[PDB]
Amino acid sequence: RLEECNILFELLTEIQDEAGSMEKIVHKTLQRLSQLLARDRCSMFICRSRNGIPEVATRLLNVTPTSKFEDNLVNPDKETVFPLDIGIAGWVAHTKKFFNIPDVKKNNHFSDYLDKKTGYTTVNMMAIPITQGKEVLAVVMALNKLNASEFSKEDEEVFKKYLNFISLVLRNHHTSYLYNIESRRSQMLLWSANKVFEELTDIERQFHKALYTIRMYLNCERYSVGLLDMTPDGREVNFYKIIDYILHGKEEIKVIPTPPADHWCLISGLPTYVAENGFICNMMNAPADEYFTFQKGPVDETGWVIKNVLSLPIVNKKEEIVGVATFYNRKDGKPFDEYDEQIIETLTQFLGWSVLNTDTYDKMNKLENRKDIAQ
């Protein structure tokens, strides 16, 4: 009716000043949109796409007009994750469509988990996805109508015409995130190549040079590149060197050769998997059976723990696997995603092609010999 907008203009300043967080602005909007909508609590599901698959997770929860954000936010550790074929939000995200629910008890796509897990059960709810281009960024819902079994088609219009706003905000956030993906990608290459072309050398120094020069860019706490014996496809393996980059804690860089059976990265059997099969392997925790990532709460003396791992092959222009580069734990506790996958494939590929100089080097030597055994 009367005091609708006001808070929008307020919030437009709060964007105006690049200082603002996104989530605090979405949380504030979900406040009045629960008050002003007479619905019990709102909540937000963040949508990402690890591996080929996509999925959803908690992010904001139980937004009462009163509740402080600092309550409302779900830190990434404590997030809860559904595939699209489970829960309403998943379905909302598959369908890319709006829904009003008169009764979720009379509903196939039900999410009985967070009802039962938190207690505070649900009866009715209206839900929508936020998208950008073809991409589905988020799923917002209003839960539990304050007055009797269904929301109005007057309510919808508000909801709709307010997510209009959040949408605007969410997209701008994501356009920024993409901007830094692609900048990170493009700096990475740029230096990866500045090294490679510096001077004709062998694989170890080239790879090493490079991966060092761009350590910052991976927003990553550990990673080990692992060189394969090259004398297809699987179980003929042998990692013969292995170069660790410890970038969380006190910065050390090992260059193990004839690396052990139980090197701290190898012990999981992931890099073998990637050696024998050839596929990027995003994963979130330490229990994936068919693996021995380090369930133990240290890896070592520093007490460092493993959460998210993502490992890829490094491949020839002939397409044999030259090595296997595993990455560990993003710097901000998020799982590896879609776009981490892409910029790191951008890297792994760019070296796998660089092997030409590597290979050239060894030849430039065999021939500098044969020549110097004339005179």
Add this chain to the structure above:
Amino acid sequence: VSFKDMSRLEECNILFELLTEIQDEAGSMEKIVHKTLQRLSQLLARDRCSMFICRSRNGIPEVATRLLNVTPTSKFEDNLVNPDKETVFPLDIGIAGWVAHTKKFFNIPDVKKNNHFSDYLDKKTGYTTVNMMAIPITQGKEVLAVVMALNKLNASEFSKEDEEVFKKYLNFISLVLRNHHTSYLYNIESRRSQMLLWSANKVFEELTDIERQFHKALYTIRMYLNCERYSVGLLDMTPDGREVNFYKIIDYILHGKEEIKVIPTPPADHWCLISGLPTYVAENGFICNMMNAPADEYFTFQKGPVDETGWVIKNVLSLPIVNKKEEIVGVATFYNRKDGKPFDEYDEQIIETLTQFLGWSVLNTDTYDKMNKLENRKDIAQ
């Protein structure tokens, strides 16, 4: 209900309208800003707004027309300014330029009583102004745009109740303009990176010689520059000024019927080289981004030529490709942005990126030579 008390209620009519619109992704920044300049006029008794755009070229910033003379009524196409017709200002001159320099808000009462005025637009259109409130739009350090509401209708100053209404909505504009201009940079970075990614790929396909490597790469990425023409000229190298000699040159024509010529010991009357630019940049190692053909010093083709095809040069950007010891090895030069607008800072950025990389890849060409002189200068012994 009172003239104000409604006018307030009416603001949210306009706002939720704008949000509603900008939820459809194509179009179009300029459309939604134009639409918003309309509703300001309506809701702020202004004869006509206008929007300027800010950019940089070489190290220097500048401002230029874009949306002009927006009543609460003028139709989009009567307002949107095509680049061919755009009018351009250095910051040290005119009010927008000054505002863009000073990153500041102004509520100018008497324009004529102002020493940063230019009589150009109002002399060009005869649409004389007198009052304007003018803001800058900004993303971090930089300045995206400048928006000025003109001629306060039934008054002589814009009320401080206008100032704040102006400001109010400009935050909308600003979210849109950042969320646009970010998305442009997103696309620049994509273009920067793929250019690298592929050039790399071709460089690493087979040990090959310079021409073959350049052509290989430069061909593959023609899509990525969004440029209408670009010739790449190779200097002789057997470190600067006049000892020049472009031995090969190699034209990339992506206007109309695509044709790629390969021109050994190219003339001087070569369409690119007549200009004098590629040579000039050959003598000093410094990037040169133009607007337009004529630029006094040079004879750049003024002609509706140079072709039978009747293609016409507007904008030229030229950079050098550098060694490792750092002679100018070649001189790339790019012509007319497909999609209308002058080369800018961000072009400079990603094209230098490309140009740098090529410079660095010359390892692999020297290496190839050395390699050939072994599969040979061993076979004189063996």
